[PDB]
Design brief:
heterodimer; A: 170 residues; alpha/beta; Rossmann fold; 5 helices; 37% helix; globular; B: 68 residues; alpha+beta; 1 helix; 5 strands; binds phosphoaminophosphonic acid-guanylate ester; binds magnesium ion; lipoprotein (chain A); GTP-binding (chain A); disease variant (chain A)
Chain lengths: 170, 68
């Protein structure tokens, strides 16, 4: 069975864990529980095909950043998450992507840009600005809400499809 | 004050620690669809630990949760 090693990255509090838990099961955590490191495994069907996802949910708090080199070397695709009401988390995306490429010594790393918390009326990052950033990166952009489950599966499955194509580019 | 815990089905978590092992691993098991009453927790270098063990007493060691 085909396997995909997904890694969820982004600043603290953007919703990485909430998104991951929503994918694994239908449940929205509404509490403060910062991640150190958590790995999840789930069998899914994508485009009619059964796949096994290994999802690494990483720490946004910089005190744990020493772990990044290792999980960036091992990960096959990266879900790069910011919150649409947190401009700083959007600015942090650039350096996560740059560090991933630095660690993997490659300009072609499967990635998806994710703007989370789209259920909020208070927005500071326009959809159009984030779409344009993704356009220039050459990667997909998806706006999600872990609270409402809007486009959560789409985000992870789009990342899988990016990896699936990258493997065939060989 | 962290403990690395290997979980069933090739999963893992790192927990920050004074509460027992059950209380501090309850959430990690629940979001993965695991009932603590169906699992045992072990200290590596395997010896079974009581779920009510103080997690503070295990800081620095690696634990493993396996289906019973
Ligand atoms: N309104 C709203 N709140 C959300 C959403 N996703 C997460 N949250 C809230 O945002 C806070 C942070 O969520 P969490 O998933 O723990 O964020 P994180 O990115 O994993 N943080 P860390 O990097 O420290 O582990 C929590 O209060 C969570 O309830 C969302 O889509 N909408
Ligand atoms: Mg988290």
């Amino acid at each position: 069975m085909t396997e995909y090693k997904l890694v969820v990255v982004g600043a603290g509090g953007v919703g990485k864990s909430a998104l991951t838990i929503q994918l694994i099961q239908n449940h929205f955590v509404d509490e403060y529980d910062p991640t150190i490191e958590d790995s999840y495994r789930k069998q899914v069907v994508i485009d009619g095909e059964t796949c096994l996802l290994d999802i690494l949910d990483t720490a946004g708090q910089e005190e744990y950043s020493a772990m990044r080199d290792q999980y960036m070397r091992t990960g096959e695709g990266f879900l790069c998450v910011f919150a649409i009401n947190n401009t700083k988390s959007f600015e942090d995306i650039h350096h996560y992507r740059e560090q991933i490429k630095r660690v993997k010594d490659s300009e072609d790393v499967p990635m998806v840009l994710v703007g989370n918390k789209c259920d909020l009326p208070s927005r500071t990052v326009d959809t159009k600005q984030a779409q344009d950033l993704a356009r220039s990166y050459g990667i997909p952009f998806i706006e999600t809400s872990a609270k409402t489950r809007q486009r959560v599966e789409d985000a992870f499955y789009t990342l899988v499809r990016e990896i699936r194509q990258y493997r065939l580019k060989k | 004050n962290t403990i690395r815990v290997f979980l069933p089905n090739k999963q893992r978590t790192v927990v920050n620690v004074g509460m027992s092992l059950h209380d501090c691993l309850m959430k990690a098991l629940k979001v993965r669809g695991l009932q603590p009453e169906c699992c045992a927790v072990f200290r590596l270098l395997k010896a079974r630990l009581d779920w009510n063990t103080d997690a503070a007493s295990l800081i620095g060691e690696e634990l493993q949760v396996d289906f019973l």
